[PDB]
Amino acid sequence: TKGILGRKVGMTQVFTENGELIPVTVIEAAQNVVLQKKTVETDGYEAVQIGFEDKRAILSNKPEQGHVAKANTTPKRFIREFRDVNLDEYEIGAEVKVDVFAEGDIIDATGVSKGKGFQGVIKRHGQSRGPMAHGSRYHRRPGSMGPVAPNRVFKNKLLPGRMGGEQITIQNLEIVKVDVEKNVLLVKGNVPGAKKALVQIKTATK
Amino acid sequence: MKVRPSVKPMCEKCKVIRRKGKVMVICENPKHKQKQ
Amino acid sequence: RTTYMAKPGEVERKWYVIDATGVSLGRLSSEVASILRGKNKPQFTPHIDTGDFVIIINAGKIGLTGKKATDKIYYRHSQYPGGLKSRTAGEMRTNNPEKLLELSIKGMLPKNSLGRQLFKKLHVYGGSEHEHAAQQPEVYEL
Amino acid sequence: IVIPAGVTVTLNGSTATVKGPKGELVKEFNPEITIKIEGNEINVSRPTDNKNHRALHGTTRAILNNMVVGVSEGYEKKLELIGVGYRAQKQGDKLVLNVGYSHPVEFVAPKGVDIEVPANTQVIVKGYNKEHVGELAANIRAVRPPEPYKGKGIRYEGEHVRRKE
RNA sequence: UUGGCACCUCGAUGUCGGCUCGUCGCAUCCUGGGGCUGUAGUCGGUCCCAAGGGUUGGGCUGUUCGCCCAUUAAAGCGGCA
RNA sequence: GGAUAAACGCUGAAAGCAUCUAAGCGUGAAGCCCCCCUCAAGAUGAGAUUUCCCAUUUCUUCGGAAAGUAAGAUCCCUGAA
Ligand SMILES: [K+]
Ligand SMILES: [Mg+2]
Ligand SMILES: [Mg+2]
Ligand SMILES: [Mg+2]
Ligand SMILES: [Mg+2]
Ligand SMILES: [Mg+2]
Ligand SMILES: [Mg+2]
Ligand SMILES: [Mg+2]
Ligand SMILES: [Mg+2]
Ligand SMILES: [Zn+2]
């Protein structure tokens, strides 16, 4: 099992040797470093703490500076643990390049979906609009809360609210291309999040 | 199986028994398998 | 006129250890509840916690007579529709017996702010070992 | 209650062991029963003659006797295959059956059990633990148990298959 | 369900059908497991366990129901004023 | 995967046989607990790991206080993913 963190650069499409055409998301995964190595005896769970981007020491702070100095590298912007991963690899301070993967290798991409604001039910939860004619004054409203008997409405009655920002994993995506010079990884299809968003790519659980 | 409150022998080879707190009859004839 | 009412801190409060091996859930819990409420002491005052602190070990060996291991069913509800989750007393004895004795004793304590405060004085272990040796506790026999 | 040559019976409370030429059998019985020992013979008794103790007296005797007969002579169970194409084989110590499915079914005989192929239409289980012998014979029969209309399938050799039109 | 009673409500507890949203039970329609078969096989009948998910779109009618066309793995029965 | 329903069985008595059960073993469902996704320590049971700042001065008879700071964070400002 093997993993990185990256930024979403965008989408494009690539022709394979068959001449088939394949959309791809681009992930730029530079400056990945191992910062801490958690254990069952120190913590209770085995995991590897990766930090992804270099940033400035005035945007940083002295705690983060200490934690990265224990790794002998710069402060980082995104820091994340990966589990179900072997610890005999991943020596502290080590740099963690995209070359750990390979073409056709197969992954789960985990990221924080895009932000739609306060939304209604038919967009958010997929409900149906009521008629727009024949006398209707019910178009995009949510429907009955429920029956009378409870004197209350049940939980998980679905209503307007803030739509996105939720964490999402997409599974069984395919890695098309690896470019260690550009620190670039190509993924068939899509991933969650806007441009410049953090993506957590890892070997698929299945 | 025939599930019935009226579990009684249907021939002479039928044999009443008590499996898992329930009255069954077993016979060579599979039809006679009764449960209560 | 004049009869003694205790005060918080007025009474010494001890730390007891019980081997729960073979004893029936309910009988052990009934003895523990009274210890925690403080009815073994004549300093008892109903609105004050005079009771003692209590430890229980070998809770995974707690006795369950009959078919209660399979037929006594604990239930939880998530307050969601169909959010009912059941689990058997024997399964709980195996995996999470601490929660089992907690559930037994909670229903046997009073249902108040005090009783909630008393539940905190209980420390349960399915094993033979506990963390509370610093308090140097005494054995209690039922 | 014979104890033939080579057999050694040992006891510790509810536990017990019996060793012999063909294997070791460590088992338990409930303690309420009572044991008495002679060099060739070991008897059992019940103190109170209530329901459970009656149930357990003959049970424990029979199970001891099974342990003894197993270490001393073992047990055999014979299964015969009936049907064209129904084929048996062992790739060494692993049974394989080819019985009209779109695949074969393989088995492994666990510690104390053994298979034998005296012919393609015949397989035999052998052991010193009667329980395991019968269980593996039963599971091997479970793959294509006999249908009535022809008898096609595995069966114990002395089994009274019922047939129909 | 048809009914019976007339116990709350007549200083107001709004009705059928549909739309939106569903949720629950199991006496399970489909899928799943199994016993008996007057079960050759295909298909089926009946019965037990199972409520996980799923359980269509139109013509006539205000209509529920129902008839029809065409599909479906299936086009479930019911409770929640 | 683990444990089960219905069911099939092994061994085995009670009841010299028989019996899937009584003690004891195995198989065994789309179901149960897990596996997969998400939220989650206000989980007052408030958890854990890593790193950072330090033990100031006034007072007050004690408790205890306020009054400037550190690590850090914000008021304010340019803004959007
Ligand atoms: K009225
Ligand atoms: Mg619509
Ligand atoms: Mg309008
Ligand atoms: Mg009024
Ligand atoms: Mg009103
Ligand atoms: Mg049913
Ligand atoms: Mg019309
Ligand atoms: Mg119409
Ligand atoms: Mg199983
Ligand atoms: Zn019969």
Swiss-Prot record, chain A:
GO terms for biological process: translation. Residues 125-147 are annotated as: Disordered. One of its GO terms (molecular function) is structural constituent of ribosome. Transmembrane segments: none annotated. Gene3D superfamilies: 3.30.160.810, Translation factors (2.40.30.10). The keyword rRNA-binding applies. Keywords: Ribonucleoprotein, Ribosomal protein, RNA-binding, rRNA-binding. The keyword RNA-binding applies. InterPro entries: Ribosomal_uL3 (IPR000597), Ribosomal_uL3_bac/org-type (IPR019927), Ribosomal_uL3_CS (IPR019926), Transl_B-barrel_sf (IPR009000). GO terms for cellular component: cytosolic large ribosomal subunit. Part of the 50S ribosomal subunit. Forms a cluster with proteins L14 and L19. Belongs to the universal ribosomal protein uL3 family. One of the primary rRNA binding proteins, it binds directly near the 3'-end of the 23S rRNA, where it nucleates assembly of the 50S subunit. HAMAP family: Ribosomal_uL3_B. This is Large ribosomal subunit protein uL3. It comes from Listeria monocytogenes serovar 1/2a (strain ATCC BAA-679 / EGD-e).
Swiss-Prot record, chain B:
PROSITE patterns: RIBOSOMAL_L36. GO terms for cellular component: cytoplasm; ribonucleoprotein complex; ribosome. Keywords: Ribonucleoprotein, Ribosomal protein. GO terms for molecular function: structural constituent of ribosome. One of its GO terms (biological process) is translation. Pfam families: Ribosomal_L36 (PF00444). InterPro entries: Ribosomal_bL36 (IPR000473), Ribosomal_bL36_sp (IPR035977). HAMAP family: Ribosomal_bL36 (MF_00251). Belongs to the bacterial ribosomal protein bL36 family. This is Large ribosomal subunit protein bL36. It comes from Listeria monocytogenes serovar 1/2a (strain ATCC BAA-679 / EGD-e).
Swiss-Prot record, chain C:
It comes from the Bacteria. Pfam families: Ribosomal_L13. Keywords: Ribonucleoprotein, Ribosomal protein. GO terms for cellular component: cytosolic large ribosomal subunit; ribosome. GO terms for biological process: negative regulation of translation; translation. SUPFAM superfamilies: Ribosomal protein L13. Coiled coil: none annotated. One of its GO terms (molecular function) is structural constituent of ribosome. Part of the 50S ribosomal subunit. This protein is one of the early assembly proteins of the 50S ribosomal subunit, although it is not seen to bind rRNA by itself. It is important during the early stages of 50S assembly. HAMAP family: Ribosomal_uL13. Belongs to the universal ribosomal protein uL13 family. This is Large ribosomal subunit protein uL13. It comes from Listeria monocytogenes serovar 1/2a (strain ATCC BAA-679 / EGD-e). The lineage of its organism: Bacteria, Bacillati, Bacillota, Bacilli, Bacillales.
Swiss-Prot record, chain D:
Keywords: Ribonucleoprotein, Ribosomal protein, RNA-binding, rRNA-binding. One of its GO terms (biological process) is cytoplasmic translation. It holds the Pfam family Ribosomal_L6. GO terms for cellular component: cytosolic large ribosomal subunit. Belongs to the universal ribosomal protein uL6 family. This protein binds to the 23S rRNA, and is important in its secondary structure. It is located near the subunit interface in the base of the L7/L12 stalk, and near the tRNA binding site of the peptidyltransferase center. This is Large ribosomal subunit protein uL6. It comes from Listeria monocytogenes serovar 1/2a (strain ATCC BAA-679 / EGD-e). The lineage of its organism: Bacteria, Bacillati, Bacillota, Bacilli, Bacillales.
